[PDB]
Design an enzyme around this catalytic site. Sequence first.
Site, mmCIF file in Angstrom:
data_model
loop_
_atom_site.group_PDB
_atom_site.id
_atom_site.type_symbol
_atom_site.label_atom_id
_atom_site.label_comp_id
_atom_site.label_asym_id
_atom_site.label_seq_id
_atom_site.Cartn_x
_atom_site.Cartn_y
_atom_site.Cartn_z
ATOM 1 N N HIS A 46 36.870 53.485 -4.037
ATOM 2 C CA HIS A 46 37.644 52.311 -4.332
ATOM 3 C C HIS A 46 38.976 52.722 -4.937
ATOM 4 C CE1 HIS A 46 36.875 51.577 -8.861
ATOM 5 N NE2 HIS A 46 38.114 51.159 -8.679
ATOM 6 N N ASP A 87 30.113 53.508 -3.556
ATOM 7 C CA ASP A 87 31.423 53.772 -4.068
ATOM 8 C C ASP A 87 31.334 55.215 -4.496
ATOM 9 O OD1 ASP A 87 33.607 52.013 -6.631
ATOM 10 O OD2 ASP A 87 33.816 53.576 -5.113
ATOM 11 N N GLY A 102 40.739 51.101 -14.762
ATOM 12 C CA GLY A 102 41.273 52.449 -14.697
ATOM 13 C C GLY A 102 40.419 53.409 -15.501
ATOM 14 N N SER A 118 37.321 53.742 -13.758
ATOM 15 C CA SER A 118 36.270 54.007 -12.799
ATOM 16 C C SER A 118 36.586 55.317 -12.072
ATOM 17 C CB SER A 118 36.144 52.862 -11.804
ATOM 18 O OG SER A 118 37.350 52.314 -11.664
HETATM 19 N N1 LIG Z 1 32.033 46.645 -17.636
HETATM 20 C C1 LIG Z 1 32.989 47.177 -16.822
HETATM 21 N N2 LIG Z 1 34.070 46.433 -16.311
HETATM 22 C C2 LIG Z 1 34.699 47.409 -15.602
HETATM 23 C C3 LIG Z 1 35.812 47.138 -14.891
HETATM 24 C C4 LIG Z 1 36.355 48.170 -14.170
HETATM 25 O O1 LIG Z 1 37.472 47.957 -13.429
HETATM 26 C C5 LIG Z 1 35.744 49.447 -14.193
HETATM 27 C C6 LIG Z 1 34.590 49.622 -14.976
HETATM 28 C C7 LIG Z 1 34.147 48.540 -15.646
HETATM 29 N N3 LIG Z 1 33.015 48.541 -16.412
#
Ligand SMILES: Nc1nc2cc(O)ccc2[nH]1
Length: 245
Positions: A46, A97, A196, A198
């Site tokens: 993603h 992902d 930001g 992930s």
């Molecule tokens: N709880 C949570 N909300 C998130 C949102 C994101 O964009 C990435 C990780 C997350 N974890």
Amino acid sequence: IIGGEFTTIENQPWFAAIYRRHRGGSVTYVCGGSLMSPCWVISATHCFIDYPKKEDYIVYLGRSRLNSNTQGEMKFEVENLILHKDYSADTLAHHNDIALLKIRSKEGRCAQPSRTIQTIALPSMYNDPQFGTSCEITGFGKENSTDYLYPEQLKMTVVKLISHRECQQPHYYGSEVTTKMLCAADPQWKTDSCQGDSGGPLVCSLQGRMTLTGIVSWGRGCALKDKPGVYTRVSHFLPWIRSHT
Ligand SMILES: Nc1nc2cc(O)ccc2[nH]1
């Protein structure tokens, strides 16, 4: 991250900061990820699927803060970026992902496993620590959702793991987490991941060993009563991870 502490890289010696280069105007932070083996980092499509020219990324290991050159980092191109042949962004929810980046210093070589640069181990097959385990996350994610700048020091937190039946509370994510998507969060409301982040790591303790239990992916809001952060569930992917590796 909307949770606990500010940390430094040697408590995270696998973190991967990934940057986009721009047409002219320079370089903005994409995502974290994690060092596999001196040639490899692991993260989530993603992040890159809209922008897939491996040549625009610049990932770092050993970097401790968003925009400052920290002690003894090494800089990387990405010799190849491999995105899952099957990925999909359902409302809120993300699918398969996962992604790999082959780094390569400007010199052609994977990285030197320093003090500030370790691998973290993959999980084994059908062995994921059980609900209620505290694991940990690292990223440079928003501190508050309302924020539009990512924090300038790195952040780490720890976060308890939820069971799929609990996380499929229809009051939570319904039938939309599934068997390969792993929920976790601090007994409600107060620390969590965010934007930001992930591509960051969820690193649970298994027998002794830090082990790459999951990869941060999505979640509806950051720090929400009934809204787990969901993390890809790494042992369901170890085939793909070796056969595209
Ligand atoms: N709880 C949570 N909300 C998130 C949102 C994101 O964009 C990435 C990780 C997350 N974890």
